[PDB]
Design a protein around this ligand. Structure first.
Ligand SMILES: CCN(CC)c1ccc(C(=O)c2ccccc2C(=O)O)c(O)c1
Ligand SMILES: CCN(CC)c1ccc(C(=O)c2ccccc2C(=O)O)c(O)c1
Length: 1168
């Protein structure tokens, strides 16, 4: 960790931002100290009502003046809350932006050796893209919110203890029980959720391995143990979900009951103090509510400390590269700018080792002379760090031992400003920049005109990707629409190097894109551009090696031989090995509800529970208003009885909550968990039925599919269980509150009726204030972050051409747009929040004024205005949640999109077809008509061109891999992993696509290539090929596979975990189990697949005794790229790029003098 302290994180503050922070803090304190003052004014107006019941002259003036004070308070909140959101959020944008401009400069100042081509560059780009966002959260409006809510607590206590210290002390002493109950509830919820996830880590995870190893499960009957096991696993998750739903019960009910008891106690003490003669009704209420709010605000105040630690750590991580001192210092004074460059580069015993891994040695005793104005090249035997000279010449690593002389002048005695111009680099795949092609050329020389650009393009023939463009000299490679990669690229690096017109040029192995006509074109382009230059070429193939004046061959640390191509080929001096190696190369909601048809009895009893629970708020508000009126009785005798009755009402309501809440939250949880289990079972049953090719897509891999099937499905519950209880409860509370409010008094309730939109909008704004007004801050900064990431990932190219000063000229001019967007967002949010709060506090001063006016005329009476005001305000409070859940109702699929995306997806091949004819017996004949296929992952490949083959019944075939010319593709076409794009597949006198292949695959077996085993013991693993596992043939399988002397010799016997659990066996012995599983099936047709030398065991004691059983009485087809233990007996064919031309036994193939078998003989001799 070693995190930086919270202070000094503002160290990037301008002299103007301090004023912004000061104004923000000053506004925040005032905005936080407002609610208690609102309670004080409300208490004063209640006192004005109470004290003047028999004199309707003073009360009018008091209500008028207090309504005016409410108007003033609303104005203050309007002009204070705006200074908290408009001065803190903006100040959090002028610092992070001012920090990135320094951070990227620091990154681009360091040496290239710091990025040693690994995950370090990924870490740096992740820090740039994501970590600065975390820094921006610790200095944004979160600190303003924290100050706001702490000042609220302080002001509440102050406006508390001063009024009536006893009542405030009671109020602050009763809240610890509620806080402790809430903490216990949260801890229990977290523990139960963790236990549920750990239970989900049980066999409910085996779905991912079944999906990954889908080829083997489709090869056998499968689809039964893969689903029954999943159901048995998810049963436990269902049970723990029931327990979790229970936990969502007693916790909330007990908290509400303790709250109700506390309210009853505090009101009873207020009522016993009021009759003594200490305080008044308008003061005890003020003290109680101020103390309650002050106590409750501290919990929200401390909720912001979570992000502060992350922000501190993020700031510490950033403040590491900033203060780093570069190893190489660019001092213009030390280096004297020279001229008359010649091109003499000479080594003086330059031995260097990488600082990251100094154990290895790279250039032990390195001494080769580079002539001026002459072409030389160095070629290595293999890829043993060949691309190392380029880094050393361009000064990316300081030579620890040795010296490099440039025209007799040491490079270390020169500044790194004008030296880099003399060297041009074209490395392996020089990544272009996602800008216009016009300014890509300008990197060589910032000051250039169009004519030299055209001359450079013509020199490198940069016209086949430029002249015939949709628009002139305008194309963004990063943009998808004009993405013009197209495999090979007309290398613009050639043109940008020619623009410099240097005398030293560097070229790496830039031929790795299926050398073709375009490669030849760029080859003669290069041959044109090497004129009078000290070019150095590194490559592996000998095509470019021939066109070199002098060739240097290195083996390790030093050059083994020099001379020229005609000399190396002579006498085979240190060159026969080189050529030997070279030659060896939406209606969703209705149907979701319909899916819960068997949950009919568990929905009604939850709905009635929600309806019953909906009667909590209005009754509590009614009792509060009634007791508020009761406090002002003249005769003290009836007060005791009324308060006792109301305390009894509170005590009853506590148990009513401890009831109704559990009743609501239990059955709904049951229904949600049942729905999740059903949808998960159906999802797996549908995804396993899908075709093989849909699994091959890069978007659809095992990890993402498992994540969607494991995590996304849970959200379905939140879309059908939690999202329906709250709406019903709030709606019924709203209705039952309006009914009572209208019954009590209607002519005053109409004013509130006309003004619910204002109060609801204001409370919605208050609710949104807790989340933050910034909004999706990553989307705005993604465009800027792309520039930094692309400049860091391509550090090799930007290091040359002196492009460091140019990157921080587009970065600065592009960073300004998010700043303006943030400023506009901040201003709009502040103004709207201020207007909303003014509407809130400006409307409550009208209802009370009209109520007082009505009382003055005698039409209405006290105990009626206050009731309809309090109950209606409290019920308008609840509408905020209903409004907040609105955007996630109509806009379905926001997170719950996988529920029907793959469940209702239509397949092309249905394994179980009722109309398909059943398959009883098969003779075992394989033949293909004129059929070709293309992989669905990338249909551009068209290797198959009119493919045909035949294997007679009761025979064997020995197809050769033929250098991987689609060798592992015929294995996937004999049985229906894929479908023929054209032509017909012929078998057993019937077309393949009219028979029930589920009944057909049970008679055909194959052998896997890459070893893989299920997370289960090997008793049914070898019995997976048949239904019914009896030890009689279990031992027989081990004897046939010859694993009986090995598997049964294990100390723990057969009952042992062999997959990704318990003991992990070697990869060279999993083929024993693989071949043991096949013998149980005893298929009429057998398939083999050996490739990539998966055995790696000389004198195999497995294949020799198993292949003999393999041929006996079976039609076997074998494909392999190795001429070892693949001796055919009936017919052998050779495939060349998706086509065969010769057929017959091994005698015919060996009878050919040379034929196509000579190439296979070459590799056979290579095996030796
Ligand atoms: C934030 C949740 N929370 C802290 C644990 C609660 C929850 C409930 C209460 C009740 O006082 C209460 C609030 C409003 C309306 C009625 C009632 C009621 O009396 O049931 C409370 O004070 C605090
Ligand atoms: C003066 C009476 N009065 C104006 C009509 C109210 C009453 C209640 C609230 C609630 O916000 C509230 C206050 C404190 C604790 C919990 C809660 C709660 O959420 O139930 C309020 O804002 C204003």
């Amino acid at each position: 960790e070693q995190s930086l302290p919270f202070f000094k994180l503002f160290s990037f503050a301008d002299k103007f931002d301090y004023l912004l922070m000061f104004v923000g803090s000053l506004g925040a304190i005032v905005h936080g100290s407002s609610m208690p003052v609102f309670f004080l004014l409300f208490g004063q107006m209640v006192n004005g009502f109470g004290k003047n019941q028999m004199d309707l002259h003073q009360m009018v003036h008091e209500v008028s003046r207090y309504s005016l004070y409410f108007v003033y308070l609303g104005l203050v909140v309007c002009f204070s809350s705006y200074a908290e959101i408009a001065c803190w959020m903006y100040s959090g944008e002028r610092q992070v932006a001012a920090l990135r401009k320094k951070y990227l400069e620091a990154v681009l100042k360091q040496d290239v050796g710091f990025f040693d081509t690994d995950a370090r560059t990924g870490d740096i780009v992740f820090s740039v893209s994501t970590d600065t966002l975390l820094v921006q959260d610790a200095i944004s409006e979160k600190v303003g919110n924290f100050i706001h809510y702490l000042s609220t607590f302080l002001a509440g206590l102050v406006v508390g203890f001063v009024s009536a210290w006893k009542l405030a002390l009671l109020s602050v002493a009763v809240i610890p029980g509620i806080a402790f109950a809430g903490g216990l509830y949260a801890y229990t919820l977290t523990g139960i959720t963790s236990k549920s996830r750990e239970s989900y880590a049980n066999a409910g995870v085996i779905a991912e391995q079944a999906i990954a190893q889908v080829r083997t499960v489709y090869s056998y009957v499968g689809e039964s143990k893969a689903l029954n096991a999943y159901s048995d696993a998810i049963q436990y998750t269902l049970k723990l979900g029931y327990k979790a739903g229970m936990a969502k019960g007693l916790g909330l009910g007990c908290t509400y009951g303790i709250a109700c008891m506390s309210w009853a106690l505090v009101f009873w003490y207020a009522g016993v103090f009021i009759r003594n003669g200490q305080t008044d009704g308008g003061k005890a209420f003020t003290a109680i509510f101020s103390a309650i709010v002050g106590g409750m605000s501290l919990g929200q105040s401390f909720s912001n400390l979570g992000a502060f630690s992350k922000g501190k750590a993020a700031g510490y991580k950033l403040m590491e590269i900033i203060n780093q001192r570069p190893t190489i210092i660019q001092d213009p004074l030390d280096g004297k700018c020279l001229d008359q460059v010649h091109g003499n580069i000479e080594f003086k015993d330059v031995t260097f080792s990488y600082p990251s891994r100094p154990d290895v040695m790279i250039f032990r005793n390195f001494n080769i002379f580079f002539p001026s104005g002459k072409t030389v090249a160095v070629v290595g035997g293999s890829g043993s760090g060949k691309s190392t000279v380029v880094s050393l010449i361009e000064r990316f690593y300081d030579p620890n031992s040795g010296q490099i002389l440039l025209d007799g002048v040491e490079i270390k005695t020169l500044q790194l400003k004008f030296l880099r111009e003399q060297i041009g680099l074209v490395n392996q795949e020089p990544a272009l920049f996602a800008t216009t092609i016009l300014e890509n050329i300008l990197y060589g020389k910032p000051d250039a005109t169009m004519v030299e650009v055209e001359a450079a393009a013509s020199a490198a023939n940069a016209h086949s990707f430029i002249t015939l463009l949709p628009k002139g000299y305008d194309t963004q490679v990063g943009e998808r629409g004009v993405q013009l990669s197209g495999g090979q690229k007309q290398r613009i690096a050639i043109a940008r190097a020619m623009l410099k017109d240097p005398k030293i040029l560097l070229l790496d192995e830039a031929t790795s894109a299926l050398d073709a006509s375009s490669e030849s074109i760029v080859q003669e382009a290069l041959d044109r551009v090497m004129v009078g230059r000290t070019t150095v070429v590194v490559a592996h193939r000998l095509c470019t090696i021939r066109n070199v004046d002098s060739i240097a061959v290195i083996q390790q640390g030093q050059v083994v031989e020099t001379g020229t191509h005609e000399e190396l080929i002579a006498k085979s001096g240190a060159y026969a090995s080189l050529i030997r190696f070279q030659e060896m190369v939406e209606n969703y909601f209705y149907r979701l509800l319909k899916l819960n048809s068997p949950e009919w009895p568990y929905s009604i009893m939850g709905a009635v529970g929600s309806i019953l629970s909906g009667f909590i708020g209005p009754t509590f508000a009614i009792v509060m208003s009634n007791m508020i009126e009761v406090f002002y009785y003249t005769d003290y005798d009836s007060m005791e009885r009324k308060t006792k009755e109301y305390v009894f009402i509170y005590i009853g309501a506590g148990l009513y909550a401890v009831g109704a809440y559990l009743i609501q939250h239990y059955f709904f949880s049951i229904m949600g968990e049942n729905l999740t289990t059903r949808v998960r079972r159906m999802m797996l049953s549908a995804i396993l039925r899908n075709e093989v090719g849909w699994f091959d897509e890069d978007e659809h891999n095992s990890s993402l599919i498992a994540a969607r099937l494991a995590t996304d499905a849970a959200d379905v519950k939140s879309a059908i269980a939690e999202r329906i209880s709250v709406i019903l409860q709030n709606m019924t509370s709203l209705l039952t509150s309006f009914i009572v409010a209208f019954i009590v008094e209607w002519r005053v309730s109409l004013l509130i009726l006309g003004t619910f939109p204002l109060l609801v909008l204001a409370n919605f704004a208050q609710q949104l204030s807790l989340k933050g007004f910034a909004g999706d801050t990553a989307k705005a900064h993604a465009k800027t972050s792309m520039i930094a990431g692309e400049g860091v990932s391509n550090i090799r190219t930007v290091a040359a051409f002196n492009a460091q000063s140019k990157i921080l000229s587009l970065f600065c001019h592009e960073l300004r747009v998010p700043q303006k967007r943030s400023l506009y967002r901040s201003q709009t949010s502040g103004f709207l929040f201020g207007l909303s709060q003014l509407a809130l506090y400006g409307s409550e001063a009208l209802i009370l004024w009209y109520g007082a006016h009505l009382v003055s005329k005698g039409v209405s009476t006290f105990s009626k205005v206050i009731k309809v005001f309090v109950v209606l305000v409290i019920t308008a409070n609840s509408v905020a949640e209903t409004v907040s859940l609105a955007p996630e109702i109509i806009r379905g699929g926001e997170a719950v999109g996988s529920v029907f995306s793959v469940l209702d997806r239509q397949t092309r091949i249905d394994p179980d077809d009722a109309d398909a004819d059943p398959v009883e017996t098969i003779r075992g004949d394989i033949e293909f008509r004129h059929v070709d296929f293309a992989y669905p992952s990338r249909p551009d490949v068209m290797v198959f061109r009119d493919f045909n083959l035949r294997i007679r019944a009761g025979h064997s075939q020995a197809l050769v891999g033929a250098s991987g010319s689609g060798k592992s593709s015929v294995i996937a076409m004999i049985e229906r992993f894929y479908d023929p794009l054209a032509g017909k597949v012929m078998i057993d006198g019937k077309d393949i696509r009219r028979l029930n292949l589920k009944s057909l695959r049970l008679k055909i077996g194959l052998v896997q290539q890459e070893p893989a085993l299920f997370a289960a013991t090997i008793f049914d693993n070898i019995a997976y090929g048949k239904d019914g596992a009896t030890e009689s043939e279990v031992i027989d399988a081990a004897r046939a596979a010859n694993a009986h002397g090995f598997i049964s010799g294990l100390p723990e016997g057969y009952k042992t975990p062999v997959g990704e659990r318990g003991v992990q066996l070697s990869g060279g012995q999993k083929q024993r189990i693989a071949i043991a599983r096949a013998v149980l099936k005893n298929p009429t047709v057998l398939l083999l697949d050996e490739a990539t030398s998966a055995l790696d065991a000389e004198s195999e004691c497995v294949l020799q005794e198993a292949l003999e059983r393999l041929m006996r009485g079976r039609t076997t087809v074998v494909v392999a790229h190795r001429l070892s233990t693949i001796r055919g007996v009936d017919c052998i064919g050779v495939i060349q790029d998706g086509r065969i031309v010769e057929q017959g036994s091994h005698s015919e193939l060996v009878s050919r003098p040379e034929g196509a078998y000579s190439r296979l003989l070459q590799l056979q001799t290579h095996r030796i």
